[model samples]
Target: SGLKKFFPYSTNVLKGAAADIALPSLAGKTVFFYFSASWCPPSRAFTPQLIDFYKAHAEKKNFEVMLISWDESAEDFKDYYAKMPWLALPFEDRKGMEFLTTGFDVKSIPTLVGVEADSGNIITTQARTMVVKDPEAKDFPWPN
Candidate 1:
């Protein structure tokens, strides 16, 4: 497995339930995997942009965002997500977090990676390019 190199992947922290989630069911859809923490200033600052992006694109495109949080609690994750207009990986799905960390190289707060809708290839490794100052303005997934 590609996970052999990571500690989070070697353990089955998110093993039972989320493992059964049919990834193929979500095939042909773009996914934004968000790695963040509440205590991080940058992550807190970027929340608005992420929220606006979620609100604007959740319906227009076949897209989903899976949040892999480094926050201390499930309540923290939920509290943050409460203000979001999109869905997330269930709280404390450590295995899911492990998957993202191992597969995506998620080493910092507020880093977002986009997975293409058809092939599941990473469309881009940086999402800050799309983070706009105006929370109301729409941003294309990638710059033109």
Candidate 2:
């Protein structure tokens, strides 16, 4: 399974509003959690796709998204989100970087993760290739 076995590793997104998100309560809903910073240019490049995914999948899957903002301030994150459709965790929440970046091994921003809705299980270890593809690619979304 290569790196696949490393997940089912716990994630902070579905753990609700905690200092560090605990394991998902039930895996009852799929998650498309995104980790981003308002200042990164690459993150800017990926925002449109993230927005596009949230627009297309928000209603279709038993899913929800919680953005873990890595910006410098609350206003910064707000300004960034003003350009997108996704919801972001409060930037001043203090837990954003520790839980989503350090704890989760996010060396880079614009990291996206997909998790199964039924078992709190990780659906893909590396969803980057799927989400970071040439926006014009044919087999995009990489399907389910």
Candidate 3:
């Protein structure tokens, strides 16, 4: 529940540049967990689409997405995350990482899980399906 509130945020460390950034307040928002990796082809395919979708709707709809990396190493994680414009769980947050991967029952890569910010209730575990079904992402986190 407090994952979003207290989750440590960090800069996307690229090859030769680093910019510090703080995560957006998750209060009163619909948060999504994105489990993916740069090495995964499917994840690569979906990342751009997700980024566009997030940029388009994030501010307007009170939505937030947290990236949970599945990369092999810290460097790979940083390099891959540089392409994203959203918050990510710090590589050092092992407990948070565990909670997201194992606690959420994420058995596959590129899974998107949406949760209500206030209630911490899962809006849907089939978030990737919902996004794909609604390419434009209109009325996202669609009515249950």
Candidate 4:
């Protein structure tokens, strides 16, 4: 199928392995799909910076970051989330997480793909670069 809105539908949020909350609406919000794992050193190292960036701009720029874990278990997923203050696809939704990685052609951890909310098309696969350069995300969903 053509590139469609990320999550074009609602998903469950993991506020930790035991907590499941309703996902917020993504309509019109630029979404960043963050692929990472707790076991990956690079992922662990980059997370704090990513978290700082997200906290600075998420509400201001009509954006959201959804964690897609590569963790080995639900416990690992929850442990990793301790460093994140953003939303995530529930750890049990392995199928959905798999689909995201495959669909986005994500071959590595610590990848952040930013997509346009209206088009669902990717604005930048180098979202990490954009965020690092512009932590405020003043030019979010960056231009090519």
The top-ranked prediction according to TM-score is 4
Q: Which stretches of candidate 3 lie over 4 Å from their true place?
A: 1-24
TM-score pick, better of 1 and 2: 1
Give the poorly placed runs of model 4, Cα more than 4 Å off. 1-10, 15-24
Model 2 TM-score (2 dp): 0.66
Which candidate gets the maximum lDDT versus the true structure? Answer: 4
Candidate 4 lDDT (Cα, 0 to 1): 0.77
Ranked candidates (lDDT, high to low): 4, 3, 1, 2
| True-vs-predicted CA distance for residue 2, candidate 2, Å | 24
C-alpha TM-score for every candidate: 0.69, 0.66, 0.81, 0.84
Q: Write the per-residue lDDT of candidate 2 for residues 1-144, one digit (tens) a residue.
A: 221222233333222233354334324655655787778988888787766765666665545566777878777876776676544455665654465466456787778776665554556545555755634434433434
lDDT of 3: 0.74
Question: Roughly what TM-score does model 3 have, to 2 decimal places?
Answer: 0.81
Error of 1 at 133 (Å): 7.9
CA lDDT, every model vs. true structure: 0.63, 0.58, 0.74, 0.77
What TM-score, to 2 decimals, does candidate 4 have?
0.84
lDDT minimum window of 10 residues, candidate 4: 1-10
Candidate 1 residue-wise lDDT at 7: 28
Identify the superior model by lDDT, candidate 2 or candidate 3: 3
Number of colliding residue pairs in model 3: 0
lDDT for 12 in candidate 3 is: 33
